[PDB]
Amino acid sequence: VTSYIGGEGHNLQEHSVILIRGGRVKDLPGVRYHTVRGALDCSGVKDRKQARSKYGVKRPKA
Amino acid sequence: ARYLGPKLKLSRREGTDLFLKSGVRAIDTKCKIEQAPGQHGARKPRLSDYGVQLREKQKVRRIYGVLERQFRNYYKEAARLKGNTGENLLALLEGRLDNVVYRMGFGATRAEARQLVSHKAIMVNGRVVNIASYQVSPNDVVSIREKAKKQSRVKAALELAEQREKPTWLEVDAGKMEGTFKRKPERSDLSADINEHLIVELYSK
Amino acid sequence: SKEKFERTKPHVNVGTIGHVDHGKTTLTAAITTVLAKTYGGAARAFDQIDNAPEEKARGITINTSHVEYDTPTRHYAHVDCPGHADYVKNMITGAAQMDGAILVVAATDGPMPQTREHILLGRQVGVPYIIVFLNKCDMVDDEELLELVEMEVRELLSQYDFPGDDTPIVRGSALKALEGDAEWEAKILELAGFLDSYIPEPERAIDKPFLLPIEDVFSISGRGTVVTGRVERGIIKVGEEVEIVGIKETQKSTCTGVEMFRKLLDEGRAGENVGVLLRGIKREEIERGQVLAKPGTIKPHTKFESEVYILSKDEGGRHTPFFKGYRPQFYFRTTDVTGTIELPEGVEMVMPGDNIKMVVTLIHPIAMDDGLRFAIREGGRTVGAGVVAKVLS
Amino acid sequence: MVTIRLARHGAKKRPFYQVVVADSRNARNGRFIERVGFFNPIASEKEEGTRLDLDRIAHWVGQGATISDRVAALIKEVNKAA
Amino acid sequence: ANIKSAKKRAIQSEKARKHNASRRSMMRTFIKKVYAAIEAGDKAAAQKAFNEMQPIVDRQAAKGLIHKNKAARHKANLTAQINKLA
RNA sequence: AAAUUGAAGAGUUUGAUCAUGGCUCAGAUUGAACGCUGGCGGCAGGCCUAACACAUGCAAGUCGAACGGUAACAGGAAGAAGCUUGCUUCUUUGCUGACGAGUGGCGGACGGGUGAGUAAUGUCUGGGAAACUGCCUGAUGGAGGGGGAUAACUACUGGAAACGGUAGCUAAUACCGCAUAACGUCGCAAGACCAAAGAGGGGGACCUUCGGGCCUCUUGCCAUCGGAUGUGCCCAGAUGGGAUUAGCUAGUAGGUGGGGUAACGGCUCACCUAGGCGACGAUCCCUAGCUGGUCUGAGAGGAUGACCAGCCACACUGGAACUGAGACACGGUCCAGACUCCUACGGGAGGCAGCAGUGGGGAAUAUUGCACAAUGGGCGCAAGCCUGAUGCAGCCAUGCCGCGUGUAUGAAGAAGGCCUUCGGGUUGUAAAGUACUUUCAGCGGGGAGGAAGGGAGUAAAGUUAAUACCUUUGCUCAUUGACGUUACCCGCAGAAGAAGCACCGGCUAACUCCGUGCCAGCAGCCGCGGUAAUACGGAGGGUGCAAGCGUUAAUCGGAAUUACUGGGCGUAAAGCGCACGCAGGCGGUUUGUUAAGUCAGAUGUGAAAUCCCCGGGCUCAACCUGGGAACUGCAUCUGAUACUGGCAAG
RNA sequence: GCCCGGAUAGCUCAGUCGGUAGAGCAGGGGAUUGAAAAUCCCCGUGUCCUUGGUUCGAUUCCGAGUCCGGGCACCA
């Protein structure tokens, strides 16, 4: 599946073992998923403070 | 869960007093009435057919001081009972102990009265009650605990209930620190803060 | 279901040191073999000199303290560690966990790199309590040249400020003491006499808050996850509630078992190796980078303030100054971890042979408090010794 | 063989029983063919908490049934017709 | 499941199994004595023979040897032959 | 003791507009996860994945008042022995209490778990006729006599273990025939014929081997006819998919006889006739336990059976047979398969989809709990014994609800942030200040009910031997709570210990600014974003929810978007290219006649639990529980005869 | 717990794997444009593995460590 990664900051790799939720984005062909940040080998997203529960991002960081 | 923060914020958005923070600031310095909260409070709020429903639901839950889980609970009970859910819920909303305690002057605000009911300050039928959501029965009496009969905040509140008309299903006596819940609450004096057309719209979604 | 180890007499964590091929496993077998004859009362016996499949299968040396035995004064547990330069890490951490070490050297090779490395650890990171054994003595063609061969060991001691002759240096042939040669069985047991008195005695921090730096971990089929290692502080008993801190998220469990040397344990004690079984824990999650403890006594940290002395070239230190922005390896209990370092206000460098205040920033968290010792290494050499003065967030 | 026994009901620390016509081949809190009463051993000020059908037990024991000991007790404090 | 705290009712089942097996073939093959009275043509002598059979035909179903209400069908199948006579 | 409250719109086609129609969407819910965050209390909930394999523990047995025995323990009884010396050792004695082990009797097949089979006469809904049973229970009879075995025990002995081996003794509620028996059994009738077991308590008299007998009571047995919870059959109607899934059957279709069955039928074997079943779905191959009921929605319809409860099948696999009322079976027996394990290499051992525990799978899951207190179940002659059955604390935000985290008051509102017209405004009475209590948590104090039964003493009654024995009650008091400092309540400071999470372009509640400047990404659709963006990301403020929060998936809704409820077809996707005409459907008009359906009526049923309506209760709620309302139909049968249907004529 | 290998401009290719790392290809910016493509005119990248060491000299060697692959190795 092709799976969207949201916000800038990418800790996932061409062998990063990860979890993915549904991400609806018919804007991009075939993309029906979204990759969960701060789960398995994927770390949380950069420059977030309005999310804590989303992106795996915890009580806020830079 | 209860409001621990600044209480007068709410009244300014909701176009009502909410019967909390009923004090005053001196000479109307930065008095912040007749405005909605924050720097953008002079901007008009914008509606939709569901938006009106969410703003009316916030209103009723700020009137009677109840959670959304409490209001969802009472609305299931309203629908369990025969007749129409709308009027069945309005009967539920008016009878509960925390509201009857504010009506009966024990709390000069809603938050004084909810703290009184939790903190065993009111006993009802002569038996101690530590929950906001106890239904007072007709012709029964709510009665202050001795350790709350000393509370200066309550003693001022019960005087603020004298020469103050009370909803005609109850009376209170400052001198006893006891109030008779004389009869059942009456929709022909007080009703809740929502639209009876909107409450059946969401099942069609 | 298992049988119980009983905490009688004092008890100590020790270990062999020296090179590969020298005797590093032979000596620790051979002492325990003659101990069962001499201390224990037995006659030379075939089951004395060989050991069971079941211990060999797990005590591969490099992950397990495979050896437990008894002497007239104390019980011992003992750790086995690599004798080669391809792998030294489990010695240099094991030094801070042990109360002393058993130094083996072979006349056949002469001294090799790990007989000269492991002797330094008791100054550098651990404790200076070393007892010595000269192996393969029977090989040398002249006895009067064997006597000069032993003056080499007194020099090797004297290189790292160990007293060259007031250290006990037994002469022996450990594989001949092991098998039951009449001359070499009679020239090993002097070493257990010294082991009973050179420590001199263990002392255990069993008053303090429980700290088990985990050495190793096991997966019991049908029962789950046991975490084990030398206890640095405190106590455990069966049914205690326990916290795992360190390189992972902090979580709580119940210690529902307590064991030592594959036996159930009436009480886990400081200064000795102890294992703990854990309720509702799965072998998928746990790692050795963890530290078991009493809930809310110690927390994971990546950052810490510390005092650290930089060695002088005299002590085998640097001769070049130690600049800011270095990436030394630290040594904490069972585990090593690397951090980037910082120097005080207006200090770009500190000279060799001088003390400084430092702030470290590790590349992974470990459980830390004040008063925990380390040594630093910068690659090719150890360069300093220090202590965590407080933790940082 | 048929029995008149307790089958168990009610929440933790606050139990209940339905008195029931059952078989010993059945499960205690499961299969029964009739409820002949109710017994709340703990409840206070609950008038609807307790019944027992004496008329029904008299039919069953005529068909060769046995009353269990809780039932044989409870019929002596319930009225001898129901 | 895997275990029970006792094992002896399982051995009670084998003790019973072998004493039933050893005599279920006994009580049924005596009928070769009955068959000669069926062959002799005469209903009363056929019946007297089946009455000589009745001692072992009721006990074979009382006992474990075939269990249940199995005497009734054996008496029925053997009668359905000898009731052709009169 | 009654009943309904339900049906929707919104973003999106173009320069502008109507209709049609897809797409997206607001709602509700899950044994759900993910990720953040979290204090307190009640009741509830926690594999929804591998029917995949389980370490280790633990889950129905029990009676010495069936029998033979005497390992253990204590005692009595007797002997013997020692300055432990009239106090003390050893021995003997089954002599007694008693019980290790054996024989023996009934349930272990029960409870508990799982959803793998089965699209099924299991199950749902309702009837039909040839059926049966543990054991409880109604009721009738019987108990003659004789013969016979062997383990335990006794001795001897092999192997690593499984496994035992060798030889001897003997008892029963153990073994067996004949006898002997009721409303009994078979037989068309004559007539023949059917069981089996005793044991235990005790007294005046009476025998006596002084064991025992007799006597009488108690307890137990066996046959047999009745009742009953439970269970089986038969029958009717219903039960997902592939028709690009067309043949299936003779052990059939029909019949007849034996065999066989609890009973029943080609069940099965055989004969005889040739029929039966299907393309409006035989057959073939695929999936799936069902159902009360759970979720969703006007409901139809759809999803769905889970938490609780009725029922079925199954328990690592394959073959078979049995114990017993009943089981190719979960807890058991022989063998095989695979794996695994012990092993002296010969041989043997095992299956948590019981309870707790665990590895693994996977997106994901409690303590090798605790307890005799109370409920049921199994043995018990009775006292009693068993039970992870049962009850009940723990863990965890898994479920639902209720409560709290302080509050009355209080400004030149003061700094700051934010916004700004640069005045101030605002965040916010929020802070500072003034006034007050501690609920809850903590700690301390006090403490109900879940408890009934059961034990023993003692008196009377009954049973009875005048008498004990046997037993019930009355009465006395012996004794009984895991959960547990309980439920619930009282004392005591003191705000002390209790707020994070998501959202702000519109649909969608929240607006302004700044930066990154078509970038970061951003929304589900239309789309936003290309240097002063409520669309990004942040700030502040605002909005919304709250110890839970968002988000993702899944189901159902909006949808009438397969339209009975509720659509179009000239042309919106669209009427067969046309005729002729069977299947099946539909049938003018008139005379007579009929009614199962319909309709009127009745009888039988969908019980409980679950559901719904109305009560009651645990302080309230969640939660628990009663009563009352619901079950339109279905099976069968009775009246009317307009009508569908039936029968006959015109 | 440890040990081993891989880290030349976005891409590519060279460079005693000891002797100050060199060049190319493609692309981006600006202008055009409200912006972009394309075009036209200008221009940059080296994580030459991070970081300590060895030496007369580190790009290329040794330890320390990250990501990613691989090795050593266990069941109280």
Rounded distance, CA E46 to CA E65, Å? 25
What pairs with residue C213 in β-bridges? C291
> Which of C2, C4, C9, C84 is flagged as catalytic?
C84
Q: Which helix H or strand E contains C77, and what residues bound it?
A: strand C75-79
Task: Name the 3-class secondary structure at A61.
Answer: strand
The yes-or-no answer on residue C84 being catalytic is yes
Residue numbers 146-175 of B with CB closer than 7 A to any atom of strand F = 147-148, 150-154, 156-157
The answer to whether the C-beta of D50 is closer than 7 A to strand F is no
Tokens for C105?
Answer: 């050297």
Rounded distance, CA A41 to CA A18, Å? 6
Residue B128 φ/ψ, nearest 5 degrees: -70, 140
- Total tally of structural domains belonging to chain E: 1
Task: Name the 3-class secondary structure at B105.
Answer: coil
Q: Is C11 among the annotated ligand-binding positions? A: no
For residue E37, give its domain range.
1-86
The answer to whether residues C368 and C291 touch, using CB atoms and an 8 Å cutoff, is: no
Tokens for E76?
Answer: 């029925």
Tokens for B87?
Answer: 């009027």
The yes-or-no answer on residue C141 being catalytic is no
Q: CA of D37 vs C1' of F613, distance in Å?
A: 22
Bases of strand F lying below 7 A from some protein CB: 3-10, 24-29, 34-37, 39, 43-44, 53-62, 102-112, 132-138, 175-179, 185-196, 222-224, 226-230, 258-263, 297-298, 309-311, 315, 322-327, 329-333, 350-352, 354, 357-363, 365-368, 374-378, 386-387, 389-393, 395-396, 400-413, 417-419, 425-430, 435-440, 449-454, 483-484, 486-487, 489-493, 495, 499-504, 506-512, 520-527, 534, 536-554, 557-558, 607-609, 613-627
Quote the DSSP letter at residue C181.
Answer: -
Rounded distance, CA B96 to CA B124, Å? 12
Quote the DSSP letter at residue A22.
Answer: E
The answer to whether residues E74 and E64 touch, using CB atoms and an 8 Å cutoff, is: no
Contacts of residue A42, Cβ cutoff 8 Å, sequence gap at least 6: A11, A12, A16, A18, A19, A35, A36, A56
The answer to whether residues C310 and C352 touch, using CB atoms and an 8 Å cutoff, is: yes
Q: CA of E70 vs C1' of F189, distance in Å?
A: 27
Q: CA of B24 vs C1' of G38, distance in Å?
A: 70
Rounded distance, CA B91 to CA B101, Å? 17
The CATH number that domain B94-180 falls under is 3.10.290.10
Characterize the bridge pairing of strands B127-128 and C75-79.
unpaired
Q: Is C325 among the annotated ligand-binding positions? A: no
The CATH number that domain B7-93+190-204 falls under is 1.10.1050.10
Instruction: Domain ranges for chain B, please list them.
Output: 7-93+190-204, 94-180
Contacts of residue C97, Cβ cutoff 8 Å, sequence gap at least 6: C13, C79, C126, C213, C215, C229, C230, C232, C333, C334
Q: Which residue is nearest to nucleotide G69 (CA to C1')?
A: A15
Intra-chain end-to-end CA distance of chain E, in Å: 61
Quote the DSSP letter at residue C301.
Answer: E
To what resolution in angstroms was this structure determined?
Answer: 13.2
Q: Which residue is nearest to nucleotide F506 (CA to C1')?
A: B48
Bases of strand G lying below 7 A from some protein CB: 1-4, 50-54, 62-69, 72-76
The yes-or-no answer on residue C21 being catalytic is yes
Q: CA of A43 vs C1' of F520, distance in Å?
A: 18
Q: CA of C21 vs C1' of F19, distance in Å?
A: 96
Rounded distance, CA D23 to CA D30, Å? 10
Strands (E), chain A: 2-4, 19-22, 31-36
Tokens for B54?
Answer: 């969410």
Rounded distance, CA C10 to CA C202, Å? 7
- Total tally of structural domains belonging to chain D: 1
CATH code matching the domain that covers C205-299, chosen among 3.30.70.141, 3.10.580.10, 2.40.30.10, 2.60.40.10: 2.40.30.10
Dihedral sign (CA C367, C369, C375, C376): positive
Domain C300-392 coded CATH 3.20.20.70: no
Tokens for C350?
Answer: 């500190």
Tokens for C285?
Answer: 């999650």
Q: Is C137 among the annotated ligand-binding positions? A: yes
Q: Which helix H or strand E contains C307, and what residues bound it?
A: strand C299-310
Residue numbers 9-48 of E with CB closer than 7 A to any atom of strand F = 9-17, 19-21, 23, 43-44, 47-48
The answer to whether the C-beta of B65 is closer than 7 A to strand F is no
Q: Which residue is nearest to nucleotide F260 (CA to C1')?
A: E77
Tell me the Cα Rg of chain C: 22
Instruction: Domain ranges for chain C, please list them.
Output: 9-202, 205-299, 300-392
Q: Is C296 among the annotated ligand-binding positions? A: no
Q: How far is CA D74 from CA A56, B49, D36, D39, D53, in A?
A: 62, 62, 12, 9, 10
Label residues D38-57 b or e (16+ Cβ within 10 Å = b): bbbeeeeeeeeebebbbebb
Nearest to B174 by CA among B160, B187, B188: B160
> Which of C16, C25, C93, C302 is flagged as catalytic?
C25
User: Residue B123, Cα to own-chain centre: how many angstroms?
Assistant: 19
Q: Is C248 among the annotated ligand-binding positions? A: no
Domain C9-202 coded CATH 3.40.50.300: yes
Over chain D, what HEC string results? CCEEEEEEEEECCEEEEEEEEECCCCCCCCCCCEEEEEECCCCCCCHHHCEECHHHHHHHHHCCCEECHHHHHHCCCCCCCC
For residue D10, give its domain range.
1-81
Q: Is C84 among the annotated ligand-binding positions? A: yes
What approach was used to elucidate this structure?
cryo-EM
Rounded distance, CA C173 to CA C189, Å? 12
The answer to whether residues B150 and B177 touch, using CB atoms and an 8 Å cutoff, is: no
Residue A58 φ/ψ, nearest 5 degrees: 60, 175
Where do we find the tokens 């032993």? C150
Q: Of all nucleotides in the shown strands, which has a C1' nearest the CA of D41? A: F450
Q: Is C138 among the annotated ligand-binding positions? A: yes
Angle at B99 between CA B94 and CA B100, to 5 degrees: 85
> Which of C24, C75, C78, C187 is flagged as catalytic?
C24
Q: CA of C293 vs C1' of F323, distance in Å?
A: 57
Burial class of residue C55 in the structure, from the number of CB atoms within 10 Å of its CB (0-12 exposed, 13-18 middle, 19+ buried): middle
Rounded distance, CA C264 to CA C6, Å? 9
